[PDB]
Scaffold this active site. Structure first.
Site, PDB file in Angstrom:
ATOM      1  CG  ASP A   1      -0.459 -13.517  -0.064  1.00 30.82           C
ATOM      2  OD1 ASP A   1       1.186 -13.786  -0.280  1.00 30.82           O
ATOM      3  OD2 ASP A   1      -0.516 -14.151  -1.252  1.00 30.82           O
TER       4      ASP A   1
ATOM      5  CG  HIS B   1      -6.398  -8.518  -4.679  1.00 30.96           C
ATOM      6  ND1 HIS B   1      -6.322  -8.853  -5.471  1.00 30.96           N
ATOM      7  CD2 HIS B   1      -4.328  -7.724  -4.435  1.00 30.96           C
ATOM      8  CE1 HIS B   1      -5.520  -8.228  -6.142  1.00 30.96           C
ATOM      9  NE2 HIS B   1      -4.505  -7.988  -5.976  1.00 30.96           N
TER      10      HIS B   1
ATOM     11  N   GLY C   1      -4.440 -11.203  -0.757  1.00 27.64           N
ATOM     12  CA  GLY C   1      -3.106 -10.524  -1.708  1.00 27.64           C
ATOM     13  C   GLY C   1      -2.856  -9.670  -1.022  1.00 27.64           C
TER      14      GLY C   1
ATOM     15  CG  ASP D   1      -2.187  -2.844  -9.127  1.00 33.11           C
ATOM     16  OD1 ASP D   1      -1.668  -2.861  -7.627  1.00 33.11           O
ATOM     17  OD2 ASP D   1      -1.625  -4.124  -8.467  1.00 33.11           O
TER      18      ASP D   1
ATOM     19  CG  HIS E   1      -1.977  -7.709  -8.983  1.00 34.43           C
ATOM     20  ND1 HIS E   1      -0.404  -7.036  -8.594  1.00 34.43           N
ATOM     21  CD2 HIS E   1      -0.947  -9.195  -9.330  1.00 34.43           C
ATOM     22  CE1 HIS E   1       0.695  -7.510  -8.560  1.00 34.43           C
ATOM     23  NE2 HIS E   1       0.180  -9.106  -8.642  1.00 34.43           N
TER      24      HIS E   1
HETATM   25  O1  LIG Z   1       0.391  -6.109  -5.666  1.00 37.48           O
HETATM   26  C1  LIG Z   1      -0.694  -6.390  -5.193  1.00 37.48           C
HETATM   27  C2  LIG Z   1      -0.719  -7.939  -4.168  1.00 37.48           C
HETATM   28  C3  LIG Z   1      -0.117  -8.829  -4.739  1.00 37.48           C
HETATM   29  C4  LIG Z   1      -0.487 -10.051  -3.218  1.00 37.48           C
HETATM   30  C5  LIG Z   1       0.771 -10.931  -3.665  1.00 37.48           C
HETATM   31  C6  LIG Z   1       0.032 -11.796  -4.738  1.00 37.48           C
HETATM   32  C7  LIG Z   1       1.386 -12.893  -4.947  1.00 37.48           C
HETATM   33  C8  LIG Z   1       3.174 -12.280  -4.660  1.00 37.48           C
HETATM   34  O2  LIG Z   1       3.095 -12.340  -5.377  1.00 37.48           O
HETATM   35  N1  LIG Z   1       3.497 -13.419  -3.511  1.00 37.48           N
HETATM   36  C9  LIG Z   1       4.618 -13.051  -3.589  1.00 37.48           C
HETATM   37  C10 LIG Z   1       5.636 -11.995  -4.303  1.00 37.48           C
HETATM   38  C11 LIG Z   1       6.629 -11.993  -4.079  1.00 37.48           C
HETATM   39  C12 LIG Z   1       7.624 -13.309  -3.414  1.00 37.48           C
HETATM   40  C13 LIG Z   1       6.645 -13.648  -2.489  1.00 37.48           C
HETATM   41  C14 LIG Z   1       5.814 -14.213  -2.870  1.00 37.48           C
HETATM   42  N2  LIG Z   1      -2.168  -6.150  -5.877  1.00 37.48           N
HETATM   43  O3  LIG Z   1      -2.116  -5.751  -6.793  1.00 37.48           O
HETATM   44  K   LIG Z   2      -5.495  -3.800 -12.299  1.00 29.91           K
HETATM   45 ZN   LIG Z   3      -0.495  -5.360  -8.030  1.00 28.90          ZN
END
Ligand SMILES: O=C(CCCCCCC(=O)Nc1ccccc1)NO
Ligand SMILES: [K+]
Ligand SMILES: [Zn+2]
Ligand SMILES: [K+]
Length: 365
Positions: free
Chosen positions: A88, A130, A138, A165, A167
């Protein structure tokens, strides 16, 4: 005092280079510019974070590693996996300067608030909630939200962090898990398998920080009215219990209908009601962005919220500007919710609110 808008051409160009959200910073800035909102704000050039400023949270070993792999873009360093780099968070050339710029921009916004330059300071390219003290996570290489809170702590004895957010704001919560000087409040999707996996309503912090972390787990499909009802309920109780002196507000737009995450079903109007509620506290408020992967919708959202901060009603038509062709098929500012079910059961939501009310009874002085 007009709001402070953290901006420079070089800063936007640096933020544009993040492979996960390419050109997003340019789209946000250019839409806000096309609505003429920058003329109503104090434009402040961000300073780049010094090593000592970043080390207020991050370890020197992590920062030095990030600096080293940033030199040539070494994405195969033996220590990188230990520091959360690789998937990531790839080790791309220049990522350390990227991270220091975003960290410095949030610190600059915090410093503006300390100095009384403004009551609202905006860094839309911040919010990377994160990252841990010694680990990228992340898409986040540096936790600028933590850096901004620590800068605010030079003056303010109680800081409220609100994270809207999609997340869980785990990195910020963990940074302050053991203290009562910073209360963290996160509303987020919470479902087995959904990143980062933490932030149940039972997660309330640890030690002297017990009950100074608040988590609101929410399911797919929530829309504006129910989300605002939840957010207002929680923030009303938090404000009475904690009496914050400053606020850091993370407004990641990956909750908005049309995001590829396809989880929540919000529009900027609902997020804007949450923002209005916080603004009427009339506290020093640091505004951050975050996630948001429908790039035009993220620009729509943060432009609309800039209008909210300024008390301005914006025209529905997207103005002619560099990225106008990205605003199809309708070319208006408003976002229509998807025709998807709301999976939030009213009694489960009320049970969560009941738990939080009980936790906040313990919050004293
Ligand atoms: O928005 C965020 C970052 C999210 C971090 C990624 C999480 C894992 C994920 O969704 N991976 C992914 C997304 C799209 C396609 C492939 C993998 N944090 O608030
Ligand atoms: K949040
Ligand atoms: Zn997010
Ligand atoms: K805390």
């Amino acid at each position: 005092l007009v709001p402070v808008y953290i901006y420079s051409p070089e800063y936007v160009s640096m933020c544009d280079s993040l492979a996960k959200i390419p050109k997003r910073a340019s789209m946000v800035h250019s839409l806000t510019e096309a609505y003429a909102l920058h003329k109503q704000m104090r434009i402040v050039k961000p300073k780049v974070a010094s090593m000592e400023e970043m080390a207020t949270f991050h370890t020197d070993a992590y920062l030095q590693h990030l600096q080293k792999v940033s030199q040539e873009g070494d994405d195969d360093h033996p220590d990188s996996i230990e520091y959360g780099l690789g998937y990531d968070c790839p080790a791309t050339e220049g990522i350390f300067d990227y991270a220091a710029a975003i960290g410095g921009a949030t610190i600059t916004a915090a410093q503006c608030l300390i100095d009384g330059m403004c009551k609202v300071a905006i860094n839309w390219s911040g919010g990377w909630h994160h990252a841990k003290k010694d680990e990228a996570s992340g898409f986040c290489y540096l936790n600028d939200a933590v850096l901004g809170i620590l800068r605010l702590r030079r003056k303010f004895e109680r800081i409220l962090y609100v994270d809207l957010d999609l997340h869980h704001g785990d990195g910020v919560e963990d940074a302050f898990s053991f203290t009562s000087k910073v209360m963290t409040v996160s509303l987020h999707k919470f479902s087995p398998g959904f990143f980062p996996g933490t932030g149940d309503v039972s997660d309330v912090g640890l030690g002297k920080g017990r009950y100074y972390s608040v988590n609101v787990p929410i399911q797919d499909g929530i829309q504006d009215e129910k989300y605002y009802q939840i957010c207002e309920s929680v923030l009303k109780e938090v404000y009475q219990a904690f009496n914050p002196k400053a606020v850091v507000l993370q407004l990641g737009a990956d909750t908005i209908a049309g995001d590829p995450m396809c989880s929540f079903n919000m529009t900027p109007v609902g997020i804007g009601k949450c923002l209005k509620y916080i603004l009427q506290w009339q506290l020093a408020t640091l505004i951050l962005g975050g996630g948001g992967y429908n790039l035009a919708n993220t620009a729509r959202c943060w432009t609309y919220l800039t209008g909210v901060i300024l008390g301005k009603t914006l025209s529905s038509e997207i103005p002619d500007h560099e990225f106008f062709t990205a605003y199809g098929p309708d070319y208006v500012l408003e976002i229509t919710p998807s025709c998807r079910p709301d999976r939030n059961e009213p009694h489960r939501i009320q049970q969560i609110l009941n738990y939080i009310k009980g936790n906040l009874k313990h919050v004293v002085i």
